[PDB]
Each structure stands twice: as C-alpha cells, then as structure tokens.
Design a protein around this ligand. Structure first.
Ligand SMILES: Nc1ncnc2c1ncn2[C@@H]1O[C@H](COP(=O)(O)OP(=O)(O)OC[C@H]2O[C@H](O)[C@H](O)[C@@H]2O)[C@@H](O)[C@H]1O
Ligand SMILES: [Mg+2]
Length: 330
C-alpha cells in the first residue's frame, strides 16, 4: 500500500520511547492493575512540566544503534559494539541487565579484538536468553527495506550482547514485527502468517513459532483473561516471554478492549494494555509501542503523551536520519 512515510519512522521511534518511559514506571511490579495504569496516564496528561519521565537502557541502546546506522549505513558491528560499551560507560545506571554489564566491561578492555566474543562467553558459553537484543532492534527494520537485511542485521546487532538463539531470534522476530507493521496497513491474519512463515524457516523445538501459534489461538478467542495471556506468552525479561507478548499486545489493540476507554487511540491502548500485563513492562511496552508506532504512525503519538518523555525532541530528530537511510536502500 503506502510507501513508508517519515510519519511511520517517527511513529515507531516515539512509540518505543513512550513505551520505555511509561512502562518503566511499573517495571518489576508483576501484579499490575489496569486502574493504576489509567490513573497514571490521566496524571501524565495534566503534568505542567515537560520531560518528567526518564528513559532506561531500552532507549539508551536504541540511540546507540541509530547513531551506528547513521554513521555506518552499511552496518558496522564493530562501530555498534563500541557505541554500546561507551554508552554504558557514560550512563551505567539507566537500568541494564546484571549479565549484559559484563559484556560492556569486556568490550571496553584492550583484552578483546572479536566484538562477538564477550557475548559468546556469557553464562558458561550458552549466551544471554534476555530481551535486551529485542528491546533495541526496531531501528533495523526502519533503516533496511529488504527483509533479508532486516533478519541478518537484527541477528548481528543482537549478537553483540545476546549469543543464545533464544536471544538473537527474539531480536529477529521483534524486528520482523516492525518490518511488516511498516509495509502498509496489513491485516491481522496476514501479519501473523508472515511472522510464522519467516520464523518456521529461521528456527527450523520451534519456541517462537509455537508462541506465535498460541497467539493466533488467542486472537480467535474473545475476552481472554490477562492471567491466560501471561500464563502462555509470559511477561518476563526472557526474549521468549516478552517478544511474542509484545506482538500479541499490538494485534489485540487493533480492536477495542472493553476495559480501555475508546477515547484512547490504538497506540495509547497498546501501551496501556502492555503495561497492564505486568512483568518487564518497560521492555514489553517499548517493543509493542514500536510495532504500533510503525503501523499507526506519528498521528497517534499525542502531544500530551510525548512531551512527558526525556529526549522526545532528539528522538524525533533521529527519525529523519533513519528515514534517509531507508530511502537510500530502496
Ligand atoms: N543463559 C542464561 N543463563 C542464566 N541466566 C540468564 C541467561 N540469560 C539471561 N539470564 C538472566 O537474564 C538477566 C538479563 O539478561 P542480560 O543479558 O543481563 O540483560 P538484557 O539486556 O536481556 O535485559 C533484560 C531486561 O533487563 C533490563 O531491565 C532491561 O531493560 C531488560 O528489560 C540476567 O541478569 C540473568 O539473571
Ligand atoms: Mg529498561
């Protein structure tokens, strides 16, 4: 349908920033109540001062990825690794995982010449199964039209910290989700078909595909409890329990949720619903918000919501530069 607009590249970046900043406020609290979320959102819209919400590691790594792609459009993983590690070093308290810290320490030492190696040594050679690969990967889909490029650069961006296939395939799936959200206004069943299609290839036991199948099920039900969603899809720091959950959040909120006032637009709905799931609300909201931002575009990123976020202005700016990458690759 559409060729991809700047509105959609902005959409996706602001969506992710929103999901980070807002979901951070409920993170690690795993009983979250939708009433608390709505109450927070109302308070947010009335805030007199701007920039009251600070972003976390999710956004910090995101901006590193973007500065790398801008600087090295061809994709330079050494450059990207350098940016990750210096970002960590500049702002180490933004919320990073306890494991991934050790990667940044290693990459910052003279001791390593292979940038993938520290990630390979995580957890006894098995590598991290965490969602930190996925939480930052969106920009790959915004910079690279060609799905092949999206897959291999998602893998490789992720592999700088997440050496387990659980870790890097989560990053691929989340980057795919954004890719297809972008390519016109796809229908729910087509969107899933695409994702199952690509992940059956990439994976083939079949963890992500089975979660993705589980998702197909849930969208054929109506009034699915949050318990059931959390039970099957998860709401965890593990990529396997967050990426599919974020994807489900996005698809669900294409339609009305009886419990969320219809005066909230689709992207708002998506963020509110993500946070209501609890767990790692931060990373799930940032991922779902990126998919939703790519799909509905900037028009659903409301002035009252976005003015609350740290670095909103810089985010909007960076999207123009991402957009130019995208346009170059066509
Ligand atoms: N293979 C493994 N073996 C044992 N434990 C693991 C393994 N993989 C992960 N863990 C556990 O997973 C934890 C995180 O793995 P990390 O690779 O540090 O971090 P991230 O970048 O994925 O970020 C994950 C979230 O954390 C932040 O809030 C971010 O904002 C994300 O929301 C470890 O400390 C382990 O207990
Ligand atoms: Mg975080």
């Amino acid at each position: 349908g559409p060729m991809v607009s700047l509105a959609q590249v902005r959409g996706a970046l602001c969506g992710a920033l929103l999901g980070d900043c807002m979901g951070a406020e409920f993170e690690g609290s795993d009983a979250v109540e939708l009433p608390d979320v709505l109450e927070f959102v109302r308070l947010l819209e009335k805030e007199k001062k701007a920039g009251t919400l600070f972003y976390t590691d999710d956004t910090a790594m995101t901006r590193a990825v973007i500065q790398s792609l801008i600087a090295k459009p061809d994709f330079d993983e050494v450059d990207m690794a350098k940016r990750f590690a210096e970002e960590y070093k500049k702002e180490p308290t933004r919320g990073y995982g306890a494991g991934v810290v050790q990667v940044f320490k290693k990459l910052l030492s003279p001791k390593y010449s292979d940038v993938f190696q520290p990630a390979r040594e995580q957890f006894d050679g098995k590598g991290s199964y965490g969602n930190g690969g996925a939480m930052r990967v969106a920009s790959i889909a915004l910079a690279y039209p060609n799905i092949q490029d999206v897959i291999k650069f998602a893998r490789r961006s992720a592999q700088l910290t997440h050496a387990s296939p659980l870790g890097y395939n989560g990053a691929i799936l989340q980057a795919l989700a954004v890719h297809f959200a972008l390519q016109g206004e796809l229908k729910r069943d087509t969107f899933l078909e695409q994702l199952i299609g690509e992940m059956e290839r990439i994976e083939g036991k079949l963890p992500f595909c089975s979660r993705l199948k589980k998702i197909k099920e849930f969208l054929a039900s109506s009034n699915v409890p949050k318990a059931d969603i959390v039970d099957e899809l998860g709401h965890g720091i593990a990529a396997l329990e967050s990426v599919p959950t974020a994807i489900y959040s996005f698809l669900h909120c294409m339609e009305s949720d009886p419990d969320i006032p219809d005066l909230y637009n689709n992207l708002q709905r998506t963020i509110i619903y993500s946070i209501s799931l609890g767990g790692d609300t931060d990373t799930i909201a940032t991922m779902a918000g990126a998919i939703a931002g790519a799909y509905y575009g900037m028009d659903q990123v409301t002035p009252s919501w976005k003015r609350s976020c740290e670095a909103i202005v810089e985010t909007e700016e960076s999207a123009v530069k991402l957009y130019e990458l995208y346009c170059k690759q066509l």
